[PDB]
Amino acid sequence: MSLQMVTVGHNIALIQPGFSLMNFDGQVFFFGQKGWPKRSCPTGVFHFDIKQNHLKLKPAIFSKDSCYLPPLRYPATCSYKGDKHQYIIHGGKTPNNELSDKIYIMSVACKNNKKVTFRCTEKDLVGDVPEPRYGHSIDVVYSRGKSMGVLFGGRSYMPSTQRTTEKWNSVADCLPHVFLIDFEFGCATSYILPELQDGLSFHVSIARNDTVYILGGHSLASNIRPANLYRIRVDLPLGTPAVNCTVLPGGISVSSAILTQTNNDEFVIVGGYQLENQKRMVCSLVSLGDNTIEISEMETPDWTSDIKHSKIWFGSNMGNGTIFLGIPGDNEAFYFYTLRCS
DNA sequence: CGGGTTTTTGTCTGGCTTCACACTTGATTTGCATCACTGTGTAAGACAGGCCAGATCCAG
Numbered sequence A: 001m002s003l004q005m006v007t008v009g010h011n012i013a014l015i016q017p018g019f020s021l022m023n024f025d026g027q028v029f030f031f032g033q034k035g036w037p038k039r040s041c042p043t044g045v046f047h048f049d050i051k052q053n054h055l056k057l058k059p060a061i062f063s064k065d066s067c068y069l070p071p072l073r074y075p076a077t078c079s080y081k082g083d084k085h086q087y088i089i090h091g092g093k094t095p096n097n098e099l100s101d102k103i104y105i106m107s108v109a110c111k112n113n114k115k116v117t118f119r120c121t122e123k124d125l126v127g128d129v130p131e132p133r134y135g136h137s138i139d140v141v142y143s144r145g146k147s148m149g150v151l152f153g154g155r156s157y158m159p160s161t162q163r164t165t166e167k168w169n170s171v172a173d174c175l176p177h178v179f180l181i182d183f184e185f186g187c188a189t190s191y192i193l194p195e196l197q198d199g200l201s202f203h204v205s206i207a208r209n210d211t212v213y214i215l216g217g218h219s220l221a222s223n224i225r226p227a228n229l230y231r232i233r234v235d236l237p238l239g240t241p242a243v244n245c246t247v248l249p250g251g252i253s254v255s256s257a258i259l260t261q262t263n264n265d266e267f268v269i270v271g272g273y274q275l276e277n278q279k280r281m282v283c284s285l286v287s288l289g290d291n292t293i294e295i296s297e298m299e300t301p302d303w304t305s306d307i308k309h310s311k312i313w314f315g316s317n318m319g320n321g322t323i324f325l326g327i328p329g330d331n332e333a334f335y336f337y338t339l340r341c342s
Numbered sequence B: 001c002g003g004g005t006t007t008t009t010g011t012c013t014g015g016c017t018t019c020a021c022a023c024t025t026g027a028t029t030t031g032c033a034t035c036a037c038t039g040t041g042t043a044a045g046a047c048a049g050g051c052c053a054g055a056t057c058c059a060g
Helices: none
Strands: A002-005 A022-024 A027-030 A046-048 A078-083 A085-089 A103-106 A108-112 A115-118 A121-123 A136-143 A148-151 A153-156 A171-173 A179-180 A187-190 A206-207 A210-214 A229-235 A242-248 A259-263 A264-271 A284-287 A295-296 A314-317 A322-328 A334-340
Touching: A078 A136, A136 A206, A136 A210, A148 A229, A179 A242
Parallel strands: none
Antiparallel strands: A002 A334, A022 A027, A027 A046, A078 A085, A085 A103, A103 A121, A108 A115, A136 A148, A148 A179, A153 A171, A179 A187, A206 A210, A210 A229, A229 A242, A259 A264, A264 A284, A284 A295, A314 A322, A322 A334
């Protein structure tokens, strides 16, 4: 817990709320800029590099067989190492306010002189495909030497029937179904769980060997931020998979929280949004066991007077137990701070 | 495809209004053309080129 100011280069206007920092072997990379990419960097992926408390965003290139995906403002990021380390991107929101549904897979194809070359391959789904949506979260699951993705519901626009031009930007939470996506083939399947009763968005999901921990979130159906955490334990036999969910005591009511990993089988979460005009300022610690959980309240960081009164704040995860968050200014549009918690 | 029964009107009828209608000229009052100018055009992005830095290579 140690705040620190971070200066910026010339291209500060390219950062916007909802970006996604991706980490590949120590190097943190930027994605999800504002507007369509210009001739400064046609790809849109930037080398997120901080040195001497100073940010320097520089362009990056793709391979000769990649796919130039549009910048997304609320994708679903997750790590996947099952080989070549690679990330997964689903959903998002294009700069034309259009929701995407295609899955993109990032990967490092070549590198030299500290200059990487990405490989963005397109991935399509079959069977029970999910509605294009944002604010959701996807995780990976390992079971009996086999991988599988878990996609929880989020929010999206009106369906193609009731959507009218007088409410063209209305948003409703998607149905609380669990989607299992096989990355090797591309076949998704929708399951129903009686425990999942209401839609949830902007939540935080913790992944492990074979169980996903959904903690907190925001429900648009009733405008309530619940304080219940879920435990979706799955299994991958030779036959059809089986999913189960059990509610658990001791939840947390936070929306738009930023999660990061500190040690092996241990996570720390920072504040998000507690109420509409009330802002969560104290952090929480998540300690895992083998079939149990544990939450506690760490020492509150030495917040500054500008953050203590700012209404909006956003950020993401760098990867080395470090959080990069920003504060809006006036008319220098954002003030970006970093946070290290070992 | 046209018979009854009221509406809808121009007159017949001649005799009472209130406005209409020839001339001036000297003003007096309106109406309209003319002339040199006006505002709204009002922040960033693409590209080539010199410059060191540092990586790339040479030979004792």
